[PDB]
């Protein structure tokens, strides 16, 4: 059994060591569903996925299927996609518009709020219907993105995010009109632990600046240019959140990274012109030179990952210690030119879908890591997470928070440290910021 003492020993942020059992152990996974996914804020999508009354999206919170649905009064409700009678899925399609929901098993009927409004033969058989609707989650929106949490005692979304918000606003708060999601959500299955995926977008620019994506950059650069002529971005920074295990990393003053991925038209839109000036104006309060930030990765713990410059967003749905589902979509500025929106759409497919020239190599790596962890000796020794150890500072002139070098694992150590904290501290009294 996993005692709080034993759980604390799994992660050491001071020495920079990780016990590989965290990615493979079945008992730890089952505790994760309770201690981590059962009380964290999880991304379910965007407001534009459910714009009108009755519009729904069927998604997940961990392994719990949920229904996100817009109400008549313009609010958004999130409830468990499970009938409390005998457990049948209430909402059986991916997305659409509903006037009501009905259980296919015994015909228990619900309104779009998830309230139990009709029980067949109730008079002859029965009990209060208001007590027997499916479990409701707390719902909160941050600039278009819809988050949900089961735990009433968990801190609110804003407090939960903390000083990670400036780096989210780089993507979300560029225009007064806000963002909108491009239609369609890509879904695929990777046989690996969610933490490898979450850590990568939290802290791992290192893999993109080294060997993983040499072929991906080759795919993006002009035919006349070869790999030896490709510019190697080395300048940049990394952010670790004060609380929550959130993290971000970005390049500074070197577009070669973004140029290969998103093309010249997107890079021009991101760095030059009226749109880039307005974005820097709106982000003036943070004091960040957002036009100099070119290519960024970010994770909101545990499983909300995005690439602010490229506008790729994904949720990692856990499927046991050895599997995940990747659900991916893309955002654009609501008032962005139709030509720019097409460039974001086409390049996001080209790079980050299941067949994407970047994604292909990520899954290839994670698949083999997980397979290795079936071995006894492969779990017997700690992984090295000592990169950038004691090199981050809280007083950077350009970027707020605990900031270090772009090639570091300070954000990673913070992610695993917070994981450890969520896994070992049952009461929010000690866990909260």
């Amino acid at each position: 059994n996993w005692t709080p003492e034993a759980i604390r020993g799994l992660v050491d942020q001071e020495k920079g060591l990780l016990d590989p059992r965290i990615y493979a152990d079945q008992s730890l996974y089952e505790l994760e569903l309770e201690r981590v996914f059962g009380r964290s804020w999880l991304l379910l999508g965007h407001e534009s996925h459910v714009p009108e009354t009755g519009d729904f999206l069927a998604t997940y919170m961990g392994e719990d299927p949920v229904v996100m649905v817009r109400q008549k009064d313009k609010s958004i409700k999130v409830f468990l996609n499970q009938c409390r009678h005998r457990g049948m899925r209430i909402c059986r399609s991916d997305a659409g518009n509903a006037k009501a929901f009905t259980c296919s098993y015994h015909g228990w009927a619900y309104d779009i709020a998830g309230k139990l409004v009709n029980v067949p033969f109730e008079k002859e058989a029965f009990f209060d219907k208001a007590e027997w609707g499916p479990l409701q989650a707390r719902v909160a929106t941050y600039k278009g993105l819809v988050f949900a949490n089961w735990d009433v005692q968990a801190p609110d979304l804003e407090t939960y995010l903390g000083d990670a918000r400036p780096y989210m606003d780089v993507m979300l708060d560029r225009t007064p009109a806000g963002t909108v999601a491009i239609g369609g959500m890509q879904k695929w299955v990777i046989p690996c632990n969610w933490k490898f995926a979450a850590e990568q977008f939290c802290s791992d620019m290192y893999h993109a600046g080294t060997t993983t994506h040499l072929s991906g950059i080759l795919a993006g650069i002009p035919p006349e240019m070869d790999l030896s002529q490709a510019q190697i971005p080395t300048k940049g920074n990394q952010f670790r959140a004060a609380w929550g295990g959130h993290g971000s990393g970005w390049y500074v003053d070197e577009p070669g990274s973004l140029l290969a991925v998103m093309g010249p038209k997107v890079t021009q839109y991101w760095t030059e012109g009226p749109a880039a000036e307005l974005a820097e104006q709106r982000l003036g309060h943070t004091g960040m030179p957002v036009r100099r930030m070119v290519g960024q990765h970010m994770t909101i713990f545990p499983t909300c990952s995005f690439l602010p410059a490229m506008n790729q967003i994904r949720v990692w749905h856990p499927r046991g210690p050895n599997e995940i589902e990747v659900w991916a979509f893309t955002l654009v500025d609501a008032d962005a030119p139709a030509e720019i929106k097409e460039e974001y759409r086409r390049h996001n497919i080209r790079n980050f879908s299941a067949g994407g020239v970047f994604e292909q190599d990520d899954g290839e790596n994670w698949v083999e890591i997980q397979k290795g962890l079936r071995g006894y000796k492969a779990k017997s020794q700690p992984f090295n997470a000592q990169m950038g150890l004691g090199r981050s500072q809280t007083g950077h002139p350009d970027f707020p928070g605990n900031v270090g070098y772009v090639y570091a694992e300070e954000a990673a150590r913070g992610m695993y440290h917070h994981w450890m904290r969520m896994m070992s501290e049952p009461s929010w009294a000690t866990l909260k910021p």
Partner: protein, 180 residues
Amino acid sequence: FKTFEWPSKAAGLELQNEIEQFYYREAQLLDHRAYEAWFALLDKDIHYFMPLRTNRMIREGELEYSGDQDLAHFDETHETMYGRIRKVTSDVGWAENPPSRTRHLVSNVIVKETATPDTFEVNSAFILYRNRLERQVDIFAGERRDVLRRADNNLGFSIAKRTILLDASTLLSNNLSMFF
């Protein structure tokens, strides 16, 4: 995407054979990783498309497929297909180095003529069996809707347009590092 609207008068035996043989030749190039030779078959105006597929109630069945404004698995031009060929033939393209072992089994070939001479709309079913490394097996099934033009090459035809309708919603594979 509804039932392929086949012509009433079926295509001639010669034409039916020519196009079937083209696909078998195309399958041979892909299954033996002749990516440079395969890329040469794609015309400059190529649209290579694989829309997303979603679960929908019959009443909302028109929303099954992603549109041309939505995300997709593939939505490629000649310029972007070139980059993918450069990656797949690259020594540092880890997803396909070591390469996978694939089989494109092709049947259900239906041939339709267009307004343009020597240009054909072709519907066909496939099963793609992908095996890689030690034990990974990914099986794909679907149909392809091609626009083929006659060309002076080893295969006899060139590909002007291709749409792939895969029988999947959530992809059961970790990637789509293969060509359809």
